[PDB]
Paper text:
Curli are functional amyloids that play critical roles in biofilm formation and adhesion in many Enterobacteriaceae. In this work, we show that [name] forms a stable complex with [name] via a 1:1 stoichiometry by lining the extracellularly faced lumen of the nonameric [name] channel via its N-terminal 27 residues, creating a secretion channel with 2 constriction regions for curli subunit secretion.
To improve the resolution of the cryo-EM structure of the [name]-[name] complex in order to accurately locate side chains of 9 Asn36 residues of [name] that consist of the upper constriction region of the [name]-[name] channel, the purified [name]-[name] complex was proteolytically digested with chymotrypsin to remove flexible regions of the [name]-[name] complex that may affect the stability of the complex in the detergent-containing buffers and increase particle heterogeneity on the grid. The resulted protein sample (denoted as the [name]-CsgF20–59 complex) contained a variant of [name] that includes residues 47–252 in complex with the most N-terminal 40 residues of the mature [name] (CsgF20–59), as confirmed by mass spectrometric analysis. In contrast to the oligomerization state exhibited on size exclusion chromatography, the [name]-CsgF20–59 complexes tended to form filaments with varied lengths on the cryo-EM grids. Using a similar cryo-EM structure determination approach we obtained 2 maps for the nonameric [name]-CsgF20–53 complex and the nonameric [name]-CsgF20–59 complex, with an overall resolution of 2.9 Å and 3.2 Å, respectively (S4C, S4D). The structure of the nonameric [name]-CsgF20–59 complex was obtained from an interacting mode in the filaments through which the most C-terminal 6 residues of each CsgF20–59 fragment interact with the periplasmic regions of each [name], stabilizing the conformation of the 6-residue loop of CsgF20–59 in the structure but with relatively weak densities. Structural analysis indicated that formation of the filaments of the [name]-CsgF20–59 complex on the grids during cryo-EM sample preparation may result from 2 types of inter-complex charge-charge interactions.
Numbering used by the authors:
A (entry chain E), B (entry chain B), C (entry chain H), D (entry chain F): 47 to 252
E (entry chain e), F (entry chain h), G (entry chain f): 20 to 59
Amino acid sequence: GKIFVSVYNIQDETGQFKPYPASNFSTAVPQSATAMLVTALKDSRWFIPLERQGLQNLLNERKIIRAAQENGTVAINNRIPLQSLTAANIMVEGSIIGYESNVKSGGVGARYFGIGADTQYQLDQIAVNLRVVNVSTGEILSSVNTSKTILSYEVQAGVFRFIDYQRLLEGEVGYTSNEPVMLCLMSAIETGVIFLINDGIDRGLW
Amino acid sequence: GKIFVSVYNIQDETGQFKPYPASNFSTAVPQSATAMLVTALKDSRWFIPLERQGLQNLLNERKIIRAAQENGTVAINNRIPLQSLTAANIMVEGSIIGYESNVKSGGVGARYFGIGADTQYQLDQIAVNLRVVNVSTGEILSSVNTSKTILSYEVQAGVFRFIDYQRLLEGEVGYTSNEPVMLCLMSAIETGVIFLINDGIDRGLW
Amino acid sequence: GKIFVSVYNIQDETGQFKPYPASNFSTAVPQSATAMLVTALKDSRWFIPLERQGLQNLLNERKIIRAAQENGTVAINNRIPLQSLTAANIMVEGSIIGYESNVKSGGVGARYFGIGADTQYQLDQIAVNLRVVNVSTGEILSSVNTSKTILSYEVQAGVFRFIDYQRLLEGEVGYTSNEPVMLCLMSAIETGVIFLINDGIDRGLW
Amino acid sequence: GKIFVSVYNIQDETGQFKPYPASNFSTAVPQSATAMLVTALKDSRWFIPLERQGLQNLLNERKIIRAAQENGTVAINNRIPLQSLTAANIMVEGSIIGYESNVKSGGVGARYFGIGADTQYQLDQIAVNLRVVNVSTGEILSSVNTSKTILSYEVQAGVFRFIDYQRLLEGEVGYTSNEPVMLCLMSAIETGVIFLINDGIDRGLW
Amino acid sequence: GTMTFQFRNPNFGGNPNNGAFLLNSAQAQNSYKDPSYNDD
Amino acid sequence: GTMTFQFRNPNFGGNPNNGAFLLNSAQAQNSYKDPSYNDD
Amino acid sequence: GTMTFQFRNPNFGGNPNNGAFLLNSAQAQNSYKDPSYNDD
């Protein structure tokens, strides 16, 4: 049997925004946890998430349903039987508790006569806290802080020497790969979910 | 038979804005999901969307209708029979859970004596989460995270050498193509909708 | 026996934001205390935290539970017995009372003919105040101000001399490590929690 | 016997923010008085502070306590006897009434052939006003304005001369120490608290 | 942080202040002489 | 404060105003003469 | 105000406009002559 879990809001409590050249309002971490976390809890075959984020939309839709068939005039084929809003035994709250930019930068670049090549790397770090709280009493059953590094590297190479008396050969090839902060945040949430499931296994619950 | 689906709001939870030179308030992802998603659900022949975004405008229009013909004085030709606000069996919530700028940049450029040519490319990545929730009980039936890369490339070439003793020939031809983030977001929503339909097929529903 | 502790809000009262090149809205200290502090109190085997941050989400979830099983029609297997919101004997309030940027900067760099190397370091300092208040009477039982330095260093080296008559060898290797302000804030909160536990031990309580 | 003191809010009335390169929203003085002041009153063995900053959190926690044990069903071991919110005889209000940047700057730097060295210093000044008001009648019993200078100095030295015909020796060593404005504000609050205690001693009270 | 690939050559890649160096550092290593003088 | 690793060479690392120095400070220490003149 | 330690040399410490001076003020004090000319 699966456990009903109600994820209400996984707030972006990192408070960080992206530096120049990015916008001043461009937050460094997606505001979209409670969608990555519901996906992580759904993907793990242990939990059935309940919406609870868009609960007001669900309540207005149920208002419309209950008002459309309250006269018994709707066709018995396309009527929707509302039972009740399914209740959750536990509740997974949490936050994105931090995003430190460039916890570890670095780079080596060499260049002999004309031809040269370099490499750079930057590690950001995103930390996500997840708390399984027991809805019956309110106490926090489990609380895990997970971290994940975000590696953004860049490898370049270039030639700017003379080939003949007056024939200049310039040229260069580069490549740059940033790990998407959304994928790293999803990985941190995934590891936190596995930790919560294993912890609930290791003490009584689940 | 088609399924009534009520799309309320597909929120732009990426939190990212466009970098310089673009405005600081210029969001990187359109705020116009719940219009691309209703179009995607309408185009797939499985669903009948209900408005639910502009539901207040629909309710005021129905107020005006019910107030215009409540006296029986409107002509029997141009009277509008209001039945009831059609109820939705499921509800497709979601978000644009992320937009990472330049997940993979790169470029190769060569230039011999005078004549040269280069190429650049940048891959942005947009991720969209879609959740079919069951309106009866409130549990999330399906949840899919879809991704889509946005390739913006630029190919240039240029000549700046001397043709004669003192005759300088400068010249250059370029081209630059950015995939519209609206079309890539629509493609991500489309793939997510196909995934939701196939998932509902693969387990009981639909 | 463990003590029920209710952490409501550990506010970011430092008021500082990050300097250029970072965004103007990018706060220097994470807004995510009350998640690091609940984790610190949970990790120390002395306390059972209660949520109290997201208490409204817990109250709406309990509303949904109490409304789902108030008719006795829910299955006796998946019904959730609500007892009462567990009460806390003490309450750990607090703040991040300060973040001074570069309390101590410095750096030594030497460079002989061509080859050179340098080092920089900067110490930020984050101070966190934690107050165990007695919920019965309201008086502050314990109040501790903890500090933690955040060392960000950078070591570089570079060669720019000529190897032959007209063969220029440029090259350089660098490294840069910033301590994540989230980890240093978590360490300050940890030391403050150990201080609070030892203080409660040293006078009557606990 | 100790005096119950209720510190409500020690507001940052300096109105100053930090200059470039710091953020525009980065206030020059921590917003965290009423936490440094409660710590200063607790450390001096004369006062018992009451929370009064987070009083709403305390009142909701007492609501939860009084609602958890109002049915007599809580275990007689883990029930919390609420007596009453302890009342304060006096009340220490105040403000951070000023922060002048660079009340006294200066610096001497010499540099002979190649080798040189310099020193800079800047004195900021923070002034804190503390007012012991009598809660019975409302009149201000004591009012003290304390000042504290914040010395930020920087000592550098550097060599940029030639050692041989064509061997250039560059090099330099620096150091920079800013007094943390949080520690200087805590020292100003400390001196103000000692002044208030001695003043209450010198006329009747305490 | 986000790393963006930027060309270093002012040709094909914009940054023009990087030119006077790239050339003066390529002439400072030009070991090729005129095929007229110092030759046959 | 946050320290970011930035290359000093205008090649591989952007900062172009750092070039005219790096070269003029490498020619001011160029003790290598032409293998034609002042040689065999 | 907050004082931050910044290197003055464009090598190891960024500020590149400080280079053309540091070198021209080190050549204006270069009292070392070529060990070939004005020597043995």
